[PDB]
Design an enzyme around this catalytic site. Structure first.
Site, PDB file in Angstrom:
ATOM      1  N   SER A 130       0.816  -1.243   0.025  1.00  0.00           N
ATOM      2  CA  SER A 130      -0.057   0.021   0.015  1.00  0.00           C
ATOM      3  C   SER A 130       0.820   1.211   0.004  1.00  0.00           C
ATOM      4  O   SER A 130       0.225   2.435   0.050  1.00  0.00           O
ATOM      5  CB  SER A 130      -0.848   0.041   1.162  1.00  0.00           C
ATOM      6  N   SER A 178      -5.671   3.143   4.101  1.00  0.00           N
ATOM      7  CA  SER A 178      -5.222   2.399   3.244  1.00  0.00           C
ATOM      8  C   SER A 178      -6.249   1.461   2.269  1.00  0.00           C
ATOM      9  O   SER A 178      -5.987   0.360   1.911  1.00  0.00           O
ATOM     10  CB  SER A 178      -4.364   1.372   4.056  1.00  0.00           C
ATOM     11  N   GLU A 181      -5.025  -3.580  -6.682  1.00  0.00           N
ATOM     12  CA  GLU A 181      -5.376  -4.242  -5.426  1.00  0.00           C
ATOM     13  C   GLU A 181      -6.387  -5.264  -5.735  1.00  0.00           C
ATOM     14  O   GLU A 181      -7.228  -5.154  -6.253  1.00  0.00           O
ATOM     15  CB  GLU A 181      -5.944  -3.486  -4.330  1.00  0.00           C
ATOM     16  N   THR A 190       1.829   3.154   5.159  1.00  0.00           N
ATOM     17  CA  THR A 190       2.115   1.903   5.319  1.00  0.00           C
ATOM     18  C   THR A 190       1.776   1.003   4.071  1.00  0.00           C
ATOM     19  O   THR A 190       1.088   1.364   3.343  1.00  0.00           O
ATOM     20  CB  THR A 190       1.411   1.191   6.623  1.00  0.00           C
ATOM     21  N   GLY A 191       2.579   0.030   4.137  1.00  0.00           N
ATOM     22  CA  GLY A 191       2.149  -1.075   3.293  1.00  0.00           C
ATOM     23  C   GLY A 191       2.361  -2.492   3.962  1.00  0.00           C
ATOM     24  O   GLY A 191       3.219  -2.690   4.876  1.00  0.00           O
ATOM     25  N   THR A 192       1.250  -3.390   3.702  1.00  0.00           N
ATOM     26  CA  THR A 192       1.429  -4.650   4.357  1.00  0.00           C
ATOM     27  C   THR A 192       1.083  -5.614   3.066  1.00  0.00           C
ATOM     28  O   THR A 192       0.083  -5.176   2.078  1.00  0.00           O
ATOM     29  CB  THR A 192       0.323  -5.024   5.338  1.00  0.00           C
TER      30      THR A 192
END
Length: 265
Positions: A42, A100, A140, A209-211
């Site tokens: 993200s 996100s 996504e 953030t990104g996950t």
């Protein structure tokens, strides 16, 4: 020296760690695996918002976008509540950064228009910032799932840190637009346990953030020292050895951030 703790954290968390803090006047650049490719996850949603801001007059933010539940394909805590009403581009920006929201990301991608449902325009935008390394290829949620070593949907701490620097501290956007990006990032709700957790509270932190899968955990941030000196901090991590189902380790990014703060204090 400081590279030893980064490797120490890599061994402690069974992880690959990527850190980049751009050099400033006062401070030398911090690099650990800084030019190795890590998946955006993200984190692209931040340069994405600035893309829509860049091509579009402020009035564009009020344009309503409508969508079906077929469009909701990813973690979308905001989009799933507006399927009947739709959301304006502006709310898609807010959702994409602060929560996100994956579906808002895909719609904003569509807003850039073009091949790959907008990914090419987006990469094209990164190129206008001087970033010739990063690329977005999927939407996504597939972009979180590329196997290790695959170059699609990847960036590097080096590349994304400098991108973010231009967007928040530089002149990539005129001030009026720059304030919306910064404020959405400042009110991010998803980063509390990553870069934010590793810095003292009297440092101001804005982050995205990104996950993803394979234990992917990222945080890109702009931080302000207690005296107001800004720094860009790119921290990225994955755990490819643990497989697609490897759990991301947020504390890894928090511990790494604390290392960064110690060098910047």
């Amino acid at each position: 020296d400081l590279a030893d703790r980064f490797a120490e954290l890599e061994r402690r968390y069974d992880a690959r760690l990527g850190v980049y803090v751009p050099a400033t006047g006062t401070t030398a650049a911090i690099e650990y695996r800084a030019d190795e490719r890590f998946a955006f996850c993200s984190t692209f949603k931040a340069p994405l918002v600035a893309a829509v801001l860049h091509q579009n007059p402020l009035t564009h933010l009020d344009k309503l976008i409508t969508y079906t539940s077929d469009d909701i394909r990813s973690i979308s805590p905001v989009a799933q509540q507006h399927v009947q009403t739709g959301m304006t581009i502006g709310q898609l920006c807010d959702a994409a950064i602060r929560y996100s929201d994956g579906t808002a990301a895909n719609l904003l991608l569509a807003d850039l228009g073009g091949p790959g449902g907008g990914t090419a325009a987006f990469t094209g935008y990164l190129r206008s910032l001087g970033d010739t390394v990063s690329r977005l290829d999927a939407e996504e949620p597939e972009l979180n799932r590329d196997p290790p070593g695959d170059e699609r949907d990847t960036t590097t701490p080096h590349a994304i840190a400098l991108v973010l620097q231009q967007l928040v501290l530089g002149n990539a956007l005129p001030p009026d637009k720059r304030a919306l990006l910064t404020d959405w990032m400042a009110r991010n709700t998803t980063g509390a346990k990553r870069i934010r957790a590793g810095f003292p509270a009297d440092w101001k932190v804005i982050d995205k953030t990104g996950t993803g899968d394979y234990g992917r955990a990222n945080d890109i941030a702009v931080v302000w020292s207690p005296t107001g000196v800004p720094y860009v901090v790119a921290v990225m991590s994955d755990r490819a050895g643990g497989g697609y189902d490897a759990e991301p380790r947020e504390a890894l990014l928090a511990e790494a951030a604390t290392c960064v703060a110690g060098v910047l204090a």
